[PDB]
Amino acid sequence: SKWLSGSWGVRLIVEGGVELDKASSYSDWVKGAQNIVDNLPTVGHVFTNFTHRAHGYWFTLRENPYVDVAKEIHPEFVPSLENEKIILDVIDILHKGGKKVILYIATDGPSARSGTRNNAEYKAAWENYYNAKFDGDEGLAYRTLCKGYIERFKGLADGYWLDHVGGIAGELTDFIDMIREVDPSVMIASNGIVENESSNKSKYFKDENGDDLEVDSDGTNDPDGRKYKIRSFNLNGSYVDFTSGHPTPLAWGAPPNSWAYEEFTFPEIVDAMASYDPVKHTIKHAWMPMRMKWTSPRANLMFDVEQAYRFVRTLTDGGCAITWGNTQTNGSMTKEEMDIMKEVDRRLRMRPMPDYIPYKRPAGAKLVGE
Ligand SMILES: O=S(=O)(O)C[C@@H](O)CNC1CCCCC1
Ligand SMILES: O=S(=O)(O)C[C@@H](O)CNC1CCCCC1
Numbered sequence: 001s002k003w004l005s006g007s008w009g010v011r012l013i014v015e016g017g018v019e020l021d022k023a024s025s026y027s028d029w030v031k032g033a034q035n036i037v038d039n040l041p042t043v044g045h046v047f048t049n050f051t052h053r054a055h056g057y058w059f060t061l062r063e064n065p066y067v068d069v070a071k072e073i074h075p076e077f078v079p080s081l082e083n084e085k086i087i088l089d090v091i092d093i094l095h096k097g098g099k100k101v102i103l104y105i106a107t108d109g110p111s112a113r114s115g116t117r118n119n120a121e122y123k124a125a126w127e128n129y130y131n132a133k134f135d136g137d138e139g140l141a142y143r144t145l146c147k148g149y150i151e152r153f154k155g156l157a158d159g160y161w162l163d164h165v166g167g168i169a170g171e172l173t174d175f176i177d178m179i180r181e182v183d184p185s186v187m188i189a190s191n192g193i194v195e196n197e198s199s200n201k202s203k204y205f206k207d208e209n210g211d212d213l214e215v216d217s218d219g220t221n222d223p224d225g226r227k228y229k230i231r232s233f234n235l236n237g238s239y240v241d242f243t244s245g246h247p248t249p250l251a252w253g254a255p256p257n258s259w260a261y262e263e264f265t266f267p268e269i270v271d272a273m274a275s276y277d278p279v280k281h282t283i284k285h286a287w288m289p290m291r292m293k294w295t296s297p298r299a300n301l302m303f304d305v306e307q308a309y310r311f312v313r314t315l316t317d318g319g320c321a322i323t324w325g326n327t328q329t330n331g332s333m334t335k336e337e338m339d340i341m342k343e344v345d346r347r348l349r350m351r352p353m354p355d356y357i358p359y360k361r362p363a364g365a366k367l368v369g370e
């Protein structure tokens, strides 16, 4: 379990399903994986894909011991037999490079009742399957489909990051139970529902009256005046091993480099890990987008090297983990981001590591309550 504590990581997006088939002719994810290994020796872990980013009906593997997905469900759910080797080769390079591998799953699956883009044809094909073979029990159908791939990733995936969990077929706990039944040693994070041991509301920082804090301004030249709440990652739900780390949503106007994360979110979990008790606690982990969008290289890059270095240092010094939300082009990390990752890595290899520039509240940055 402990490998995640103090680890920093990057994302290598691998597409799934028919989208992987379409992207394979002009992309090389093997190069992208080798690129990470060769340039980022200090990186401890890499996030990549069991499903396509944010889409539960596109998988990175094809063959499945419990279902011929192409013949029984829909051919676009799986890549070609040749292209299913992409994710396997990626994992081999990362493992051979000494990296741990966390696999992303959009758990709302083909019915797409959460963040997966709705696709009527995909949903109908899926319903035809689970009604014919599972007599209407979508939850068991979905767990069984996924089980086949969890089985194939045994020893390859070191963890799983579950998204869209409010739309999962059946009970999320049954789905997590299924994973642990296949491989009880993998680390599991869930983007909601089972992280907060105390409640099913999202956890925000609060004042003495129990009201949520709100950022008013990010600084004198804040480009977006929308106020936003500040997520806490101090979450110890029993079903998960590490915190999902999803910060306040970008679409609400919360920048991923928010000063409030340096002042509230990160110090809280650094302090939590200072008392880490594996019997009681998750490994505290942050997944911070590099840009104002998670996966679009055209979105504004929100980190320079000095702030990215402080983010990684602050969290990993304290035994937390951090993952970057990197973007990919043609199967390799976007250059402008790799340049930053490389400079972070360079500094982390120095002995002593150089001090980071101290966090100071930006000019004009303030809470509503100030
Ligand atoms: O980074 S991923 O896409 O794999 C998972 C999640 O963090 C992204 N959520 C956004 C929400 C806004 C619209 C598109 C998806
Ligand atoms: O993904 S779904 O819409 O199906 C599940 C939905 O309950 C999750 N969003 C809540 C509300 C906003 C703060 C975070 C938690």
Ligand SMILES: O=S(=O)(O)C[C@@H](O)CNC1CCCCC1
Residues within 6 Å of the ligand: 202, 229, 251, 252
């Ligand atoms: O987190 S809570 O549900 O307590 C309140 C907060 O989420 C509402 N934010 C919306 C979201 C996107 C449009 C602008 C405002």
Ligand SMILES: [Ca+2]
Residues within 6 Å of the ligand: 112, 113, 114, 115, 116, 117, 118
């Ligand atoms: Ca949807």
Ligand SMILES: [Ca+2]
Residues within 6 Å of the ligand: 216, 217, 218, 222, 223, 224, 225, 226, 253
């Ligand atoms: Ca703002």
